[PDB]
Design a binder for this molecule. Structure first.
Ligand SMILES: N#Cc1c(-c2ccc3ccn(Cc4ccncc4)c3c2)n[nH]c1N
Ligand SMILES: N#Cc1c(-c2ccc3ccn(Cc4ccncc4)c3c2)n[nH]c1N
Lengths: 215, 201
């Protein structure tokens, strides 16, 4: 039973999440995802969410006063506050497993150069805060990271998304022959110990080739 | 100029997307897209037949075929730079347990193919990975290491928390030095692998 609140200046970006949520999971009260426009907490007629960086530099920084108000309203002491950032701890499958049993995730999506650091630092004095990165590339903001985190986490919550070391090897299905390429005959052999060993060797070879760091 | 075509059985999920155009294609337009795996196992595999027909129409010999997969080569900022100067990306999004391996194998006989993963976690399909890849690449298209430290803006005191005073001092050398120190500190703590040290636990 998980509530996820996402805060963003581009709420439309989170549309895929609401799309991928089965009615049965919502009706059973297994999951609730709500998306909030950060500008609801702006102070001025211009709905300002950013300002120039202290110490100079390029880009802009999201305002602490706006974010502070948003998180004050949405979070409680029990919230796990997730803050995507290219400077975060790595988000991994282990992370996803840990977070899948949380009652309440709040994902604070930044833009520009990110969020004034005092927002996360202040929040961390009264709730659990996690600054994380989904990989070693640079995005424009936290929304795509939120999509990835939400999917990785919710697919581990029994019955929410509709789904049920070494790298996975190649997979095959019908037809047995296609554009001159036959499915490896071992897979049609009915020798299931041999099939498992073949799959194990494929996994080994692929890991050596594509992810030697895993070895 | 760059053209990006995304192929998926869930075109609705790609909604978040002059020098670049992005087009989304429903795979079913070329048809049941899946069946049980040869050799056994849980779940289903996408059949190569429908994919072959779709890619035949969409791809040329100059196309870079991108195939998200948890078993891919890592997609990194270096990859994003490399792909930023491509004329044509086609992103083939799988579902279920993935796409019959012969799709990528057949495609590689006529174009360049890249199987990639955006990170070490499991998704239900390629669509979210496609959005990440598109965003990382498009921000580098012409005409568009170490972890970054913290950023601050006004007011200089908030909830009794001060912006680090060096950032208000106007001393560029000291500001550069402090920012380097925060950055070093953060990398050691959060990503020691970037500086060639063992990863935690
Ligand atoms: N997680 C994660 C990420 C992000 C990410 C996340 C949040 C924000 C907010 C703002 N930006 C843009 C930006 C900020 C600083 N430096 C450069 C660009 C973000 C990027 N990029 N790459 C990842 N793996
Ligand atoms: N890039 C990337 C990915 C994916 C991903 C990508 C494409 C597909 C198609 C199908 N699935 C689901 C699946 C398949 C096999 N094993 C487990 C789950 C996908 C996952 N997961 N994690 C990543 N970093």
């Amino acid at each position: 039973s998980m509530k996820i609140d996402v805060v963003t200046i581009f709420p439309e970006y989170l549309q895929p999440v609401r799309q991928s949520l089965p009615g049965k999971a919502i009706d059973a009260g297994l999951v609730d995802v709500a998306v909030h426009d950060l500008r609801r907490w702006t102070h001025d007629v211009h709905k300002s969410v950013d300002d120039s960086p202290y110490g100079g530099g390029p880009g802009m920084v999201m305002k602490p006063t706006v974010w502070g108000d948003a998180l004050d309203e949405i979070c409680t002491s029990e919230t796990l506050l997730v803050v995507p950032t290219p400077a975060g701890y790595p988000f991994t499958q282990e992370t996803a497993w840990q977070w899948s049993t949380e009652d309440h995730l709040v994902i604070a999506c930044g833009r520009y150069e990110g969020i004034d650091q005092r927002v996360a630092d202040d929040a961390a004095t009264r709730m659990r805060v996690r600054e994380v990165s989904i990989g070693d590339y640079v995005l424009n903001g936290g929304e795509a990271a939120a999509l990835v985190i939400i999917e990785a986490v919710l697919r581990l919550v029994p019955g929410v998304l509709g789904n049920a070391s070494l790298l996975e090897g190649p997979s095959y299905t019908r037809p047995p022959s296609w554009r001159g390429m036959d499915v490896p005959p071992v897979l049609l052999s009915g020798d299931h110990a041999k099939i498992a060993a073949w799959r194990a060797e494929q996994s080994r070879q692929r890991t050596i080739e594509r992810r030697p760091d895993l070895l």
